[PDB]
Design a protein around this ligand. Structure first.
Ligand code: HEA
Ligand code: HEA
Ligand SMILES: CCCCCCCCCCCCCCCC(=O)OC[C@H](COP(=O)([O-])OCC[N+](C)(C)C)OC(=O)CCCCCCCCCCCCCCC
Ligand SMILES: CCCCCCCCCCCCCCCCCCCC(=O)O[C@H](COC(=O)CCCCCCCCCCCCCC)COP(=O)(O)OCCN
Ligand SMILES: CCCCCCCCCCCCCCCCCCCC(=O)O[C@H](COC(=O)CCCCCCCCCCCCCC)COP(=O)(O)OCCN
Ligand SMILES: CCCCCCCCCCCCCCCCCCCC(=O)O[C@H](COC(=O)CCCCCCCCCCCCCC)COP(=O)(O)OCCN
Ligand code: CUA
Ligand SMILES: [Cu+2]
Ligand SMILES: [Zn+2]
Lengths: 269, 53, 535, 236, 48, 58, 75, 117
């Protein structure tokens, strides 16, 4: 603190955010989304182009937050060692919360799998519902996920050895190795024999493997913004926190898929 | 799954009296869906799935 | 434009707490008028004010539950006292994620609109606070009422999760130079231990509510027994949220009482490490018990015996806190100012309302008390007389420091005695009505239950007068409040000692154990430029 | 039995299970009264002695013996409470030979009683539906919102097993004197057992919320002798 | 401008309309909304 | 000039005298449609929640 | 002289929803074989007429007569 | 925006901390791309100078009015928490020294003076 011209710079390593308008606009978009989804499902509106505006405005509101998160870190230069630790602790406490939604859905499976009622004749997958064979396309998705978990390790170990062509190629291969998962799993939802309304079995199978679908669109977006921000020279060899959060998010989804494949697809009796 | 793509092209001109029998709990329509007709979900191909009245 | 960038587009943590207070006052007024509507109908046998409508009685009870579990106690105890005091106690400038604080405020006014619009488009939402599956389907409530009411429990959940992650992330790496995590004050530990339960409880509620929505409108049959489901599953997926929730309402109260007991009785708290370990034990043993709300659903005989054993164990850590408060108040000098009156009225009534919980914990005795007014009398002695009293004590403690304007002492004492008398008249004959056999959620009752219902309708009119007097106390605080510091010596934070002279006391006035009462009293916008030092 | 106007305490018992409930409650209230009196006396001593005092003992803040005494002494109370609670939970039930079965199905806003035995070769099972008598059609002396048109008639000194279910929503069978409170959920059967020691009338009300007509759904049980039960069963 | 009437969103002194009217109307609306809701849902269901 | 405009835009976002979200000469294209369509999305859910309290359906 | 079902220790719990279904299935299994007038298959008849509500039996009989019944009646 | 620093002796503000640029086809180093309060820590830690101190209070000697403990600050006030000369005897008592008055700690008695830098 006894450096000579110390008064001209901030005396504590924490970020004082400037005034931003986006919290109000996110809430005003969620107001419209909640009321429009509550109303269109019981009449009262009819036209289905207000719900789509509500979802589009929500997603643009998150994108407009993340712009001001990027400019405050690569241009203004206010991300010290403490603020990075705070961001890492923060992201870990959202990954932990997004795991515990799947715990309730797994417990909604074992409360019916072990002990089925009398209305269904006591049997899993019940009579008249042909399940999905796990020696078909649900193998291809698993091997594509295990390969995508291996390709990003070649991308995080090429930004530390200062090789640029070798970070762009790996991220490109991973981005095409998550689009194929969505394309395969939308083909496994059009060639099925049972819907969301055909049992308690068809209702919990499309509600634990449908949240995963929404969670893996987010990796395609987060990897596009990690390829595009590396192409335009924003990443240094020691200060990159966009890659570290996308790597921790991918591996949790791989481990979750390896528990959605032994409990949902293989174990039926 | 291309040998199974020729056992599903013939399950469309089957009549309503040759489709597999429908149990209870089988097609729960107790609230009509708000998109289009009320007897169709998001993903719905007629070649594999049908709702016999 | 300067109005917008400072009270609508905000970053400062202390300027959102005042908005939380203004919201909580409104949402605690609405529910209290809704409770006065209920208690003026349950007065004498017949159909008195609501002419024949048993709807618009259950709607009023549901909206009185939601507006004061979710919209009064949590915004006051998390927004007004957590956002304001925790950075000043730990010594930080602002919170770690300020824009998340702003969104955690602004998600609540869209949650009020949907709940108020869940009682005008239709018959309404008379499902009770616990929105049980086979009643809240499309055969009894067929309309946009239950759907818009379970969308008001999503936005509050998002706000609470985003606030809890901010509270945990701030206290880990934004402390001053000489504080380890064993020299923290007790209020910071209370906020941390409620913020961990907010992480570990809310996904289960969100999952259960969303599956109820999918059962109502996308014909999925999770909880319908004609397709292979059970309603009882929802009860599990509700009550795993339910019992953490009722400690979330009470743990931030406890620490507040400790500060008052440490201040106006001039002694440090007896065994602080025992107190933080007791709060940790209470927080951990609120997750391993949830099924004591469901003893009559048809469980096993070896499962009731576990949940009677795991429920009575929670009496052991709470007794440590109560007896440590007595040991703190024992030796020292006590001056009876208006925070310590509410402090003294909290150590007796929480004990009375909590000793009834041991009677209800047994599975053999719950056969006589389930869905009966004994439960209502049990949890009103702890909610209305344990949490609201802590909120009033915290307001009368910290409002001269935050605002800079003092208040009349006499009117505050009259308000306290009116609350005490009216609330003790209201909720005590509910025990007698419960022991004689009056069920819950009924507008009309047999003629034998008349007389006590005449007495419990009298205390509510006493309590509303106390609320109006509280409004006049706030008005007398804001206008001419600079001249209300020489009327009484209550304005002094600590009294002169026996040997300490007055001339010495006027030079050295404030003696404290936290950073709070040494600030200038309007707190500055940027309150720490150079860091604070602790040895 | 019937509720009394200015009631303070329980209704009178006709079943051993309710007497066990009353005895266990009166056992717990002893220790709770002891704890409340101890706390109230300590606050009285604090108010009477140490109010506006010159001397502050500001160094008595540790404790080592006294923190064990308020940790082990509540535990012994919990063990003494937990012994008869477990004995009452396990012991008093249908251990040997129930002698009748009555199915009490809960519809929307009335009750349906089937006496499942006494079956003819063609299925001539005795059955009735119990409704509430409205206020306009009451006769002189009947109890409002508790008196029905058909009542469940059972013998005395006979184990009776009630099997409770429902057809629409979640209900709750209650007769307070007999110690019976079990749910009625729409996809499963639940069972309770009752033994009645004296004749009389026993009144009850539903508990779990069901809609608009929650307050008009009573339960009425008469306990006749065996000869009157045989003469009643040959008329219905 | 830091002082005892600077952290509040509403102006209290030196004001055209006196503060009693905005203080009273806040509580009047707060204790008048849930009677309006009961009036609307009573009049929509036949009873007076 | 080259792809390292990083050493050029860091002398612009510092010393700007405008807020960060409206400093570049491109933020018009993002901020005009967003605030334009938000005032229609909010003004449509305050017309259909007041029309619906009066019982009118579509 | 007022005789009903005893204890049946394979189902000792408070939920008797499996005793009904098992008695119904066992009666129809022992009436598919061994004729319709045979003596131990009236123990099962009195067993499921003493616990099951009547509407469940009517729905199960209609579901059996339409061919549409989830069960293990085929031995 | 101006001349770039090489050591923290030539840093008179945020106007001397932009730096040179990276080259086309190279993953950039933190000495070629950093602007704000991040580069100031970087130029401190490659010499041995800790810009943001985390050293607690002096707990060696007491405080006399003739010889007081000097607390250094860039403001007219700084919050000082006393907890004893053997560093955990005294409880936590907070004090505010000012350039016009010295705090004196009502239990143990140490005097604190403010040094304005
Ligand atoms: C307000 C928060 C709150 C608090 C603090 C508690 C406290 C407790 N509650 Fe909970 N409870 C609720 C929230 C809360 N509860 C609510 C809202 C309901 C109503 C349910 C609804 O309808 O949704 C409810 C109802 C309820 C029931 C009844 C459920 C039913 O209707 O059947 C039960 C029974 O097991 C129970 C358990 C307990 C127990 C054992 C405690 C104990 O923690 C009480 C502990 C207090 C003490 C024991 C004082 C300590 C003093 C000592 C000196 C110790 C002495 C030692 C001995 C007594 C041995 N609660
Ligand atoms: C949040 C806790 C809470 C509070 C505060 C209250 C307040 C009151 N409650 Fe209780 N009550 C519940 C918990 C609570 N209640 C719950 C959860 C239910 C729903 C049960 C169900 O749905 O099954 C219920 C329902 C309920 C009913 C309906 C019972 C039913 O229908 O079965 C009744 C009727 O007698 C009743 C009684 C009262 C009364 C007379 C008050 C009065 O005290 C009201 C007067 C209010 C005040 C005395 C406090 C005013 C507060 C402020 C203005 C202070 C603001 C704070 C700051 C300034 C920091 N309550
Ligand atoms: C365009 C608008 C998109 C809006 C997305 C969110 C809301 C979706 C609600 C469900 C709508 C629905 O009907 O979903 C159907 C799909 C696919 O189901 P299907 O279309 O019946 O498939 C049958 C295919 N056959 C057999 C004919 C070949 O089923 C799915 O895959 C849906 C998955 C939804 C998962 C929700 C989980 C909720 C619980 C977690 C709560 C977290 C908060
Ligand atoms: C609602 C949907 C969830 C909302 C949360 C979105 C995910 C959390 C984002 C975590 C970002 C953490 C963070 O601050 O990282 C910055 C990068 O931001 C980023 O750019 C991260 C990109 C986040 C994009 C999120 C897209 C999800 C929306 C899809 C909805 C469907 C750091 O920047 P830095 O320090 O690493 O830069 C280095 C300078 N040299
Ligand atoms: C789903 C709701 C929860 C998702 C939020 C996850 C946010 C994780 C990333 C994170 O914690 O960073 C904060 C928000 O960034 C973000 O990623 C913004 C996400 C905001 C999503 C709001 C919920 C919409 C639904 C920083 O926010 P900060 O600006 O205070 O950091 C100021 C210093 N740079
Ligand atoms: C259940 C109990 C609930 C108690 C409620 C609270 C009552 C007021 C307690 C006030 C605090 C008393 C206190 O802390 O002082 C202790 C006195 O021990 C005592 O007064 C208790 C001593 C226990 C004696 C047990 C019998 C021993 C004789 C056996 C003969 C054979 C030790 O004072 P200190 O040592 O901490 O002072 C430390 C030097 N600053
Ligand atoms: Cu019917 Cu309750
Ligand atoms: Cu509980
Ligand atoms: Zn000291």
């Amino acid at each position: 603190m006894r450096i000579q011209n110390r008064e001209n710079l901030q005396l504590f390593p924490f970020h004082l955010v400037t005034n931003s308008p986006w919290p109000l606009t996110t809430s005003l978009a969620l107001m419209s989304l909640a009321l429009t989804l509550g109303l269109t499902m019981h009449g009262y509106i009819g036209n289905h182009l207000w719900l789509f505006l509500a979802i589009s405005l929500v997603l643009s509101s998150i994108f407009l937050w993340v712009r001001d998160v990027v400019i405050e870190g690569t241009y203004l230069g206010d991300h010290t060692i403490a603020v990075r630790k705070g961001l890492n602790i923060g992201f870990m406490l959202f990954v932990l919360s997004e795991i515990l939604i799947f715990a309730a859905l797994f417990w909604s499976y074992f409360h019916s799998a072990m002990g089925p009622t009398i209305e269904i004749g006591c049997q899993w997958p019940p009579v008249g519902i042909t399940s999905i064979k796990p020696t078909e396309l649900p193998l291809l998705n698993t091997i594509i996920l295990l390969a995508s978990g291996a390709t990003v390790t070649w991308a995080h170990h090429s930004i530390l050895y200062k090789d640029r062509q070798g970070t762009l190629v790996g991220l490109f291969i991973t981005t095409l190795l998550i689009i194929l998962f969505v394309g395969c799993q939308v083909l496994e939802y059009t060639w099925a024999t049972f819907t969301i309304a055909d049992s308690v079995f068809g209702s919990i199978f499309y509600a634990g493997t449908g949240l995963h679908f929404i969670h893996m669109v987010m990796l395609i977006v987060m990897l596009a913004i990690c390829y595009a921000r590396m192409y335009f020279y924003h990443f240094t060899s020691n200060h990159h926190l966009g890659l570290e959060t996308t790597i921790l998010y991918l591996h949790v989804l791989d481990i979750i898929w390896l528990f959605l494949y032994i409990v949902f697809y293989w174990w039926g009796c | 799954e291309a040998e199974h793509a020729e056992h599903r092209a013939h399950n469309r001109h089957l009549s309503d009296e040759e489709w597999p029998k429908a149990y209870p709990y089988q097609n729960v329509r107790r609230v009509d869906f708000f998109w289009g007709d009320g007897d169709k979900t998001l993903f719905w191909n007629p070649d594999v799935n049908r709702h016999v009245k | 434009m300067n109005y917008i960038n400072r009270w609508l587009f905000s970053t400062n943590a202390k300027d959102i707490a005042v908005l939380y207070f203004i919201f909580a006052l409104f949402c605690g007024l609405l529910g209290s008028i809704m409770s006065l509507i209920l208690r003026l109908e349950l007065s004498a046998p017949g159909n008195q004010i609501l002419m024949g409508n048993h709807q618009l009685f259950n709607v009023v009870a549901t909206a009185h539950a939601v507006l004061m579990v979710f919209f009064l106690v949590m915004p006051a105890a998390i927004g007004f006292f957590g956002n304001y005091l925790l950075p000043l106690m730990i010594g930080a400038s602002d919170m770690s994620f300020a824009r998340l604080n702003n969104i955690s405020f602004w998600l609540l006014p869209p949650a009020l609109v949907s709940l108020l619009a869940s009682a005008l488009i239709e018959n309404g939402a008379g499902t009770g606070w616990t929105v049980y599956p086979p009643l809240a389907g499309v055969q009894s409530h067929s309309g946009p009422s239950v759907d818009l009411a379970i969308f008001a429990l999503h936005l509050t959940s998002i706000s609470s999760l985003l606030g809890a992650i901010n509270f945990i992330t701030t206290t880990l790496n934004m402390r001053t130079i000489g504080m380890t995590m064993s020299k923290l004050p007790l209020f910071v530990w209370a906020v941390v231990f409620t913020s961990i339960l907010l992480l570990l409880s809310l996904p289960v509620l969100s999952a259960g509510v969303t599956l109820l929505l999918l059962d109502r409108n996308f014909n999925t049959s999770f909880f319908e027994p004609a397709g292979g489901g059970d309603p009882i599953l929802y009860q599990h997926l509700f009550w795993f949220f339910g019992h953490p929730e009722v400690y979330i309402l009470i743990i931030p109260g406890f620490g507040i009482i400790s500060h008052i007991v440490s201040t106006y009785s001039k002694k440090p708290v007896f065994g602080a490490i025992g107190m933080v370990y007791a709060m940790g034990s209470i927080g951990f043993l609120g997750l391993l018990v949830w099924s004591h709300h469901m003893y009559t659903v048809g469980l096993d005989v070896d499962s009731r015996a576990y949940f009677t054993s795991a429920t009575m164990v929670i009496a052991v850590p709470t007794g440590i806190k109560i007896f440590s408060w007595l040991a703190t108040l024992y030796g020292g000098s006590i001056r009876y100012t208006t925070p310590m009156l509410y402090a003294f009225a909290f150590l007796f009534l929480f004990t009375v309302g909590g000793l009834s919980g041991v009677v209800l914990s047994n599975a053999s005795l719950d056969i006589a008390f389930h869905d009966t007014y004994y439960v209502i009398g049990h949890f009103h002695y702890v909610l209305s007389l344990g949490a609201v009293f802590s909120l009033f004590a915290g307001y009368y403690y910290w409002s001269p420091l935050i605002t800079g304007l003092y208040y009349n002492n006499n009117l505050a004492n009259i308000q306290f005695w009116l609350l005490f008398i009216g609330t003790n008249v209201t909720f005590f004959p509910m025990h007698f009505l419960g022991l004689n056999g009056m069920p819950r959620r009924i507008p009309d009752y047999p003629d034998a239950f008349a007389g006590w219902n005449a007495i419990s309708s009298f205390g509510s009119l006493i309590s509303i007068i106390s609320v109006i007097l509280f409004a006049y106390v706030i008005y007398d605080q804001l206008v001419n409040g600079l001249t209300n510091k020489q009327l009484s010596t209550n304005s002094l934070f600590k009294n002169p000692d026996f040997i300490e002279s007055n001339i010495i006391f006027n030079d050295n006035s404030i003696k404290s154990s936290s950073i709070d009462f040494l600030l200038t009293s309007p707190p500055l916008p940027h309150t720490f430029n150079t860091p604070a030092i602790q040895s | 039995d019937v509720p009394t106007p200015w009631g303070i305490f329980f209704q009178d018992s006709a079943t051993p299970n309710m007497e066990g409930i009353i005895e266990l409650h009166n056992n717990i209230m002893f220790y709770l009264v002891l704890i409340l009196t101890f706390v109230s006396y300590i606050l009285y001593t604090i108010i009477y002695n140490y109010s506006n005092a010159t001397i502050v003992h500001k160094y008595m803040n540790h404790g080592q013996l006294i923190e064990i005494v308020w940790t082990t002494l509540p535990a012994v109370i919990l063990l003494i409470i937990a012994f008869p609670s477990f004995i009452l939970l396990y012991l008093c039930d249908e251990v040997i030979s129930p002698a009748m079965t009555i199915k009490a199905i809960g519809l929307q806003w009335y009750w349906k009683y089937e006496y499942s035995d006494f079956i003819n070769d063609d299925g001539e099972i005795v059955e009735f539906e119990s409704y509430v008598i409205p206020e306009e059609l009451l006769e002189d002396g009947q109890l409002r919102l508790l008196d029905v048109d058909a009542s469940v008639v059972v013998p005395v000194d006979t184990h009776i097993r009630f099997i409770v279910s429902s057809a629409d929503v979640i209900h709750d069978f209650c007769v307070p004197a007999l110690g019976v409170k079990v749910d009625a959920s729409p996809g499963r059967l639940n069972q309770t057992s009752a033994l009645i020691q004296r004749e009389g009338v026993y009144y009850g009300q539903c508990s779990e919320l069901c809609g608009v007509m929650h307050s008009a759904m009573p339960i009425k049980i008469e306990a006749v002798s065996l000869y009157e039960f045989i003469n009643w069963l040959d008329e219905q | 401008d830091v002082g005892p009437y600077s952290n509040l969103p509403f102006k209290v002194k030196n004001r055209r309309v006196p503060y009693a009217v905005p203080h009273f109307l806040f509580f009047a609306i707060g204790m008048g909304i849930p009677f309006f809701a009961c009036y609307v849902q009573l009049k929509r269901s036949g009873s007076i | 000039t080259a792809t390292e405009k990083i050493i050029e835009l860091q002398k612009f976002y510092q010393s700007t005298n405008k807020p960060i979200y409206a400093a570049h000469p491109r933020s018009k294209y993002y901020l005009i449609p967003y605030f334009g369509l938000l005032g229609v999305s909010v003004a449509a859910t305050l017309f259909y929640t007041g029309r619906a309290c009066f019982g009118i359906k579509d | 002289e007022l005789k009903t079902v005893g204890f049946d220790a394979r189902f000792p719990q408070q939920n008797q929803t499996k005793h009904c279904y098992q008695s119904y299935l066992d009666y129809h299994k022992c009436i598919t074989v061994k004729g319709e007038d045979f003596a131990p298959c009236k123990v099962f008849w009195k067993t499921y007429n003493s616990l099951c509500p009547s509407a469940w039996v009517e729905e199960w009989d209609e579901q059996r007569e339409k061919g549409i019944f989830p069960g293990n009646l085929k031995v | 925006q101006f001349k770039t620093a090489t050591s923290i002796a030539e840093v008179e503000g945020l106007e001397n901390l932009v730096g040179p640029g990276a080259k086309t086809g190279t993953v950039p180093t933190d000495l070629e791309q950093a602007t704000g309060l991040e580069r100031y820590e970087l130029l401190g830690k490659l010499e041995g100078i800790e810009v943001f101190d985390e050293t607690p209070l002096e707990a060696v000697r007491k405080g006399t009015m003739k010889d007081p403990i000097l607390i250094d600050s860039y403001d007219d006030y700084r919050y000082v928490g006393c907890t004893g000369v053997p560093a955990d005897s005294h409880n936590i008592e907070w004090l505010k020294p000012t350039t016009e008055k010295n705090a004196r700690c009502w239990e143990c008695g140490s005097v604190y003076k403010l040094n304005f830098l």
